[PDB]
Amino acid sequence: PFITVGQENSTSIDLYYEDHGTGTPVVLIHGFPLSGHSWERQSAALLDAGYRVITYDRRGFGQSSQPTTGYDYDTFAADLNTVLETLDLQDAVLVGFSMGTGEVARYVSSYGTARIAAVAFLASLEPFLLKTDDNPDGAAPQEFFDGIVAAVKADRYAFYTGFFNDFYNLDENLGTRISEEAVRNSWNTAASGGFFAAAAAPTTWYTDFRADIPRIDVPALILHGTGDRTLPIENTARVFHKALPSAEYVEVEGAPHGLLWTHAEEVNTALLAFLAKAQEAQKQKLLTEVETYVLSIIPSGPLKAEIAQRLEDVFAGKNTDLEVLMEWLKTRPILSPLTKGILGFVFTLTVPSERGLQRRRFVQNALNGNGDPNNMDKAVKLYRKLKREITFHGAKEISLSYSAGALASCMGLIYNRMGAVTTEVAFGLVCATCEQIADS
Amino acid sequence: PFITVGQENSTSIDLYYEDHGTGTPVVLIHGFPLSGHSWERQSAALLDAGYRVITYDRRGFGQSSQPTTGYDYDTFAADLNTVLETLDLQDAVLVGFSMGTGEVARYVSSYGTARIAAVAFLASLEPFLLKTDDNPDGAAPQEFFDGIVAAVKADRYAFYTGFFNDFYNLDENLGTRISEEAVRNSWNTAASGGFFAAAAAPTTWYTDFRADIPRIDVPALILHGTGDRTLPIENTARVFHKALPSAEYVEVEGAPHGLLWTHAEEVNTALLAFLAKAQEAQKQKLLTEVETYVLSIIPSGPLKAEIAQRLEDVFAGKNTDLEVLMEWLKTRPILSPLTKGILGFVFTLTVPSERGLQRRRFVQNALNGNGDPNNMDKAVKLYRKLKREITFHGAKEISLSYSAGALASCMGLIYNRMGAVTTEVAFGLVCATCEQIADS
Amino acid sequence: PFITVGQENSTSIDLYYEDHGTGTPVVLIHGFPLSGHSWERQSAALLDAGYRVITYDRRGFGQSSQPTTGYDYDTFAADLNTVLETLDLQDAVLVGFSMGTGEVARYVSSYGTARIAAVAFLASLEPFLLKTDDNPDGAAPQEFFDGIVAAVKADRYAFYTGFFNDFYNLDENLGTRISEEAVRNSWNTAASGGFFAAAAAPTTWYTDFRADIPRIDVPALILHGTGDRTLPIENTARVFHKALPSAEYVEVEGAPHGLLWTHAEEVNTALLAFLAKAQEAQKQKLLTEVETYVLSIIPSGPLKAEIAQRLEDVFAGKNTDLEVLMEWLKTRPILSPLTKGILGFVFTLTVPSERGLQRRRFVQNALNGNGDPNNMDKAVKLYRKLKREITFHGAKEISLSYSAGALASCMGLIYNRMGAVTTEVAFGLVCATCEQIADS
Amino acid sequence: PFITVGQENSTSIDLYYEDHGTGTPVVLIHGFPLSGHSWERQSAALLDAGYRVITYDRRGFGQSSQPTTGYDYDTFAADLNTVLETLDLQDAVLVGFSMGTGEVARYVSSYGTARIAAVAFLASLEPFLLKTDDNPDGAAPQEFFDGIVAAVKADRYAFYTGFFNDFYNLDENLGTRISEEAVRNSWNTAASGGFFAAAAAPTTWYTDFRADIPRIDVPALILHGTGDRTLPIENTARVFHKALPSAEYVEVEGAPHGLLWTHAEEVNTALLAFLAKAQEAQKQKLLTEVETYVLSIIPSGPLKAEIAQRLEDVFAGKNTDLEVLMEWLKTRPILSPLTKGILGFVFTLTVPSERGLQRRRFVQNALNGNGDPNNMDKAVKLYRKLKREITFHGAKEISLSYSAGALASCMGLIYNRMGAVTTEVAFGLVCATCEQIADS
């Protein structure tokens, strides 16, 4: 599979990518000089955990096009933007390794965390590798990196051998954490890359990400091996943690630069933990917002408390019966039809096991709103806008511009299944609907 | 330029008007029997002082329509209301002369000081010209004004000659403070007016503004010449000052009624001083808005404090070096390129003595907007809209509809001098650019 | 990237190719049993020397289709013809290695040197490898080649090792001029080829090119290693030189057959020298055309002569200074502002050391186009088209469709750094603006 | 009548203009501080001579809008460009006076002589009024012009009195060549202008037109009075004549600056002469092209000679009877219907006194294009393109892309009056029609 990110002369620039599994999108950005297939140990684990795994090969690496231009992090991040937009990924998590951390930092800084839910940095370059006067926390001076470029240009194939020796810490890990054959494959992948890209890549390593770091607002994870030879822990992760103290910090003892394979077990554990925790963290903050908004329209009393209880139960994951819940709603004495309708919409939306209940009439009759053609006109116009929308805060603001009558019908469109919007947006709509009703 | 204020038979009633310069709006309302062009000496001074000068001709006067109806201050004030609402002026200053003072008093009283920041009364009619029992401070009785009307009806053209004799105090001022040609022009303007309006106007002079005066809440200025023959100082301004003691009172010694031309230097000085207090007040509120918006994108730290200080300094007029500031900006390690670009744009825009400093490379590369032809296209579409715009709030609103990428490139258009927008509009753009960045 | 050269059954026959860099087209035709990537040491050098490098994989080799037909030099040359015509290459240089030398000879003979500027033969097969009665200068008889084919059919994978043993002269060069990993990669590339193509290829080696040689009219270079085991110097290059005495003859002492890698330094040197003669020749015709176009806008006089001289100086590389030239331009009285802008653009473009000179104001104001949004809109539309373009003629042709006003603004976009186009394209634009201005 | 040339704040910038008479367009650009009505002596004469007279008032002058921006010759020329394009003038003559000469020079330089047939400079500013080191032929230094501006600002009305004293050389010419009332009117016109424009205009006088002069390729006329006090002959016209030696030079002895009125007879004579010569000159070069193309389709013989003679006669102005010509054509042997059709089209187009002859049956049936709907479709598509076209050379090229059958029908559309194209474009079509037929 390929995604076109540019054009070089008579040829086009396409990136090889892979899209597997169903769930929240997790983008895995490989490091030098490998490819997307490097994540296979992580990829295997993430697929088991019910995630949607997306991997791609950087330009001039793996199966991607090998142009002789655009080897800078502004172009690398631009490519990632194209990738995310082409696939239309929403609420996705970016995971970068080695060079890949640079792409994450730069994209977030330059394009914003709109589509991004969280970020993870494994074996990061950040904040600045170059050792200069203003940056004494650099790993090595300019002259050093110039040596690497010249080394690759001398003989890239022979370079790869020496490269992977410190990439995996073979003197320690060979025959224990990484096999001879596994290394052999990595070398093949390296050779498969572009000759130009090979020597062009090291110049990108001393990129100054210090300006990109503050723009990271989504939950972050910083992971790094102490036995990292290529990128020394202290010149990278340790100072990176000072720049981003909010980030979850993980130090894997004795892990080499290539810990994705060698210490895969420690990596998976740490990553899957961070992902599951950050997911439930944003689920709770979303559901508590929905609760307060829905309860805002319900009049204070013993009924309000009962509703609050059943809402908490389904939000907590306590598999309640839906036929019973709906029969309970239908039979309520002081609740207004619209209130019952909104509640009916919210319960079907949040309940995982629909159990087999056909779209109830009492909910449908509540949301239609007299079946005014004036109301259904604004409802489709709003529906068009919500299809493009993804953020909850984004979906709520644009919906607020519409009247309470138009909003109710819009909810009815979705309920009847004449509409296909994401849950975050659907919650945006219902919260906006509740807000208008509360002010009436 | 015209503004429709009514309708008379098959024809409509339009008022000729002029809108010049950029800044706080200053509306100049002419007197009898001239036109907006009478302010030309004031307009010249006000334009130099960076104001937005708006003048219009009263119905049946100058280039305005000449209907045979609506010659009362309730209609005159209604016309002014239409003018202010059509142009949507906000925080504007009303300046009236002779008859024009009546419009100011009545509009403020009848329509409220919502759009008005301050008011000025030059050669005022207020509070009441008619000499009666209840008003002994009147200048002349009913019978007198009936004489003027009958005099105009006899021969308005011959009337104009005798009128300007006391309007300018020609025995004193002719050949000294006003030339023969200047008077000639004034006469032409008078003759150019409506025959009906000419004789209808004097009846409006004895209007009772005594009830309108207390309704003046905005800061006021009362100016009047002691040598005023048309409107005697003691029957007008002096008693007006007792009715409005809060007002700034200025008495120009030996000045006649048409002091706008003869004693233009004394008038301008006094007026610009009174105006400057209200103008500097609105300039700061504009700069504090820009400051908060610009600081919104800068990440918290010691650097944020440093920028805010340097911003306050240039806004205050503390002539800071620009070559130094730009080199300081260029060399910051944690500032994003876009951030450096925006600040650079702001500094060149706010710093007076640009000192012939060539368009910095680092700012141009920040504002280029990744040289996306799609981003560059949207920027021009926005530039077309901003070329028409004049207000800061108006420029900010329409800019918000564009993406952050499109906005940055549009700023680049202006910075590179491929675009020509007013400073108020330019600030609207930069503030809109900051708002998008803050939301990511 | 692929180019369809034929069709075999249900599938089509596509050749993998690569197009890098901007300048004179240099087509590199690889030998047996490798691929286009073999040129990587030459390609790297050629890109530095400002050439446009075009490489492709022969059918059944590398990433190209692997059909079981068309393994003859009439088909091989037909394929090259398709490649050249598809890319529409003009004034290009053909460089062949081993088998690749045959394609050059055959194409030139069969299709003519219309698109070709010069040709290069490295480790040539020419004129005739087969040892017969009429050709005693053959390297080996028919039976020998039958042995190779049968050897490949036995086990192609085991064959490759023994092949590369004499291809690189490993007993001498291994560990000195070629590393184990480099050979390893070559083997992988070999295995990656088609099984049929592998055994079909040797039969093409004893092709009689003796009739094709006289048809070479473009300047030729003959390079060969004396230590060549695969193609013995005396049976190949030496007799080839007798057949083509006009050709530039280079003998690399002790170089093996695969000298492209082992003696890459000697090869690059020799090749770039020969290429420089052909490159500089059409380079001058490019600058001479630009000169005539630019001078077309300058009004005749002593100033016109002065400009022409300074243009010739910068084209020769003597002048080198830019700030003085720009100051000289700025102060000229007969030059239209647009003319000053165009010349300033050309000078910054042609002067090698732009130094630390900020983009001059007088050039920006000339190219700004008055800040008409309509000129800016057409300018962006033109700019996207120029981003795709590569040729000088291609850039000039598409630019001529735009108005002089739109063109000037387009130049302004690039000058201001809101645009990124190649020098050949940049010159196309300048000539097009000059053509329009001269025609206005 | 007004033409919108810009926008200032809430108001738009419109220029007052007048379009009188029928024939080739002669644009008259007034000087400071008057208006288009100043040309009345020329306009009356030009209308008698059967020309199309176009006059307009400069911004801030006469009946035009009075903005406070854009008082520079780049803006003045931009305005003129709008005027010419809005009216879609082609083959027009530009005539400038005082300030008006600057507009002519700048437009020609900046926009090209596409729509321009010839140019005239009366009482010119050119080439450079400012007296500096680089320009010793200047009239006065910078400080001098600064005095003029301050004089206008002092008292705009009183300034005019002294201005017209030297403008007309009243000590000499008053009561002889100019009446008291005429000057009075000039003063009124002066007062009618904008207060801002009045003082803004003098700064434009020291504009450097030296760079604009060489771009003048159309036939030129330089007229100037020796007794010119405002613009001394030696500092203006005399040095202008050296810069433009090709121009027809006329020196009116003893004429003042405002010679347009005083020496109107001498001015008209010289002007009408220059126009008549330039008019017949452009007729001959165009008609001889039409002649050769039309004769190309007529078969060689005595008939071909007869046609050429009658063509030369009508082109020369020997208005032959059209009823006779058409009957001569109709009853003529050996002439093909299409040939008769083409000639019939040409004769009705070139013959002045149309006499009142109906679109002949023999012409319509020739032009019908057999009644093919495909031919009628292509004819309309071409007609759309020709409506946009203006040049004769431009019209022929785009028409050549269409088939001879489609071209014939397109001519038929115009002849039947279902189409409205200019004569120059109309000639382009017929020549293109002849060219396709000629190749058969």
UniProtKB/Swiss-Prot annotation, chains A, B, C, D:
The active site is at residues 98, 228, 257. Residues 25-263 form the AB hydrolase-1 domain. Pfam families: Abhydrolase_1. GO terms for biological process: antibiotic biosynthetic process. Homotrimer. May be a chlorinating enzyme involved in 7-chlorotetracycline biosynthesis. GO terms for molecular function: peroxidase activity. Gene3D superfamilies: alpha/beta hydrolase. Belongs to the AB hydrolase superfamily. Bacterial non-heme haloperoxidase / perhydrolase family. Keywords: Antibiotic biosynthesis, Oxidoreductase, Peroxidase, Plasmid. This is Non-haem bromoperoxidase BPO-A2. The lineage of its organism: Bacteria, Bacillati, Actinomycetota, Actinomycetes, Kitasatosporales. InterPro entries: AB_hydrolase (IPR050471), AB_hydrolase_1 (IPR000073), AB_hydrolase_fold (IPR029058), Epox_hydrolase-like (IPR000639). Its EC number is 1.11.1.-. The keyword Cell inner membrane does not apply. It comes from the Bacteria.
